[PDB]
A paper describes a structure:
Monoacylglycerol lipases (MGLs) play an important role in lipid catabolism across all kingdoms of life by catalyzing the release of free fatty acids from monoacylglycerols. Here, we present a comprehensive study of five crystal structures of MGL from [name] [name] in its free form and in complex with different substrate analogs and the natural substrate 1-lauroylglycerol. Crystallographic studies of MGLs have resulted in the determination of three-dimensional structures of human MGL (hMGL) and its ortholog from a moderately thermophilic soil bacterium [name] H-257 (bMGL) in free form and in complex with inhibitors. Both MGLs possess the expected α/β-hydrolase core domain harboring a catalytic triad. The occurrence of different conformations reveals a high degree of conformational plasticity of the cap region.
To stall the catalytic activity, yet retain a WT-like architecture of the catalytic center, we generated an inactive variant of bMGL by introducing an [name] point mutation. The bMGL([name]) variant was crystallized in the presence of 1-LG (C12:0) and 1-OG (C18:1) yielding crystals of space group P212121 with six molecules in the asymmetric unit. The resolutions of the datasets were 2.8 and 1.7 Å, respectively. Of both crystals, we only interpreted the electron density of the bMGL([name])-1-LG crystal in chain A as substrate. The structure of the bMGL([name])·1-LG complex shows the interactions between the glycerol moiety of an MG substrate and residues at the bottom of the substrate binding pocket. The carbonyl carbon of 1-LG is located 3.1 Å away from the oxygen OG of the nucleophilic Ser-97. The glycerol moiety of 1-LG forms contacts with the side chain of Glu-156 and a water molecule. The hydroxyl group of Ser-35 and the backbone nitrogen of Gly-28 are also engaged in interactions with the glycerol moiety via this water molecule. The fact that only one water was observed in the bMGL([name])·1-LG complex structure might be due to the lower resolution of that dataset. The reaction is stalled before the nucleophilic attack with the entire ligand in the active site representing the Michaelis complex.
Residue numbers in the entry: 1 to 132, 135 to 249
The structure:
């Protein structure tokens, strides 16, 4: 399958060829590279080779998204991973929300990942589970992003295909079940206040992985879309320190 709608302005992937250490940045469910771009540029400015891919069916139209499965999103991250492998001796992976879910997934299936930085990664959202409750419409209306800062507009679909929620749940289930395969260092960000993903998820992740070096930083001035919120500078700074520590 291939997207039927054109890529939208602002949703372009971002690539930067610099040093031998690479960072893969993964955006979230219904989102676009916009949400991860400031992190990618800061890392690029710091001298890192950077890959920020666009997930299949994202940044085009939600009908494209509707036609995808989580295998497609996984494939989009792998292409980015593969792109960095051609260029880098050392690879870190970071991601927001489902990007974090994809970050964990990637660490579960590659042995050569140097470290991961999941940010509000999703592994258990019981509400999504609803068994499947009653019959939901085909598309759920988005009512805006979970952000503390009101003057940020995040680039994301205005509707969510309910068919994709099932895809999300499965990605989460398989990622959660195989957490013990992650052995690389982990820097885990979690928002104290989060209206999307239960913040007890960070703990499931912290406990589930086999990593010998793992930490949690609780963000106290951000909601769910933390990468664009007030704690962005800390996320960027603390991440850079992680990369240098483990290079
Ligand atoms: C009946 C279902 C209600 C709950 C809907 C679940 C939505 C969770 C989406 C996961 C988040 C995502 O991966 O990225 C977050 C995105 O940037 C939000 O703007």
């Amino acid at each position: 399958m291939s997207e039927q709608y054109p890529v939208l302005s602002g949703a372009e992937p971002f690539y930067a060829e610099n040093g031998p250490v690479g960072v893969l940045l993964v955006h979230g469910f219904t989102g676009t590279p916009h949400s991860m771009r400031p992190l990618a540029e800061a890392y690029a400015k710091a001298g890192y080779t950077v890959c920020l891919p666009r997930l299949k069916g994202h940044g085009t139209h939600y009908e494209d998204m509707e036609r995808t499965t989580f295998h497609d999103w996984v494939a989009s991250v792998e292409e980015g991973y593969g792109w960095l492998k051609q260029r880098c001796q050392t690879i870190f992976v970071t991601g927001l929300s489902m990007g974090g879910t994809l970050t964990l997934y990637l660490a579960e299936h590659h042995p050569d990942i140097c470290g991961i930085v999941p940010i509000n990664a999703a592994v258990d959202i019981p509400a999504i589970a609803a068994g499947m409750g009653g019959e939901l419409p085909r598309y759920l209306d988005s009512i805006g992003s979970d952000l503390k800062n009101p003057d940020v507009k995040e680039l994301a679909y205005e509707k969510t295909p309910t068919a994709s929620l099932l895809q999300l749940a499965r990605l989460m289930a398989q990622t959660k079940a195989k957490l013990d395969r992650i052995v690389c260092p982990a820097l885990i960000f979690v928002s104290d206040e989060n209206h999307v993903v239960p913040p007890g998820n960070a703990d499931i992740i912290f406990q589930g992985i086999s990593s010998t070096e793992k930490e949690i930083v609780r963000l106290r001035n951000s909601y769910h879309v933390a990468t664009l919120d007030y704690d962005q500078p800390m996320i960027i700074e603390r991440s850079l320190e992680f990369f240098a520590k483990h290079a």
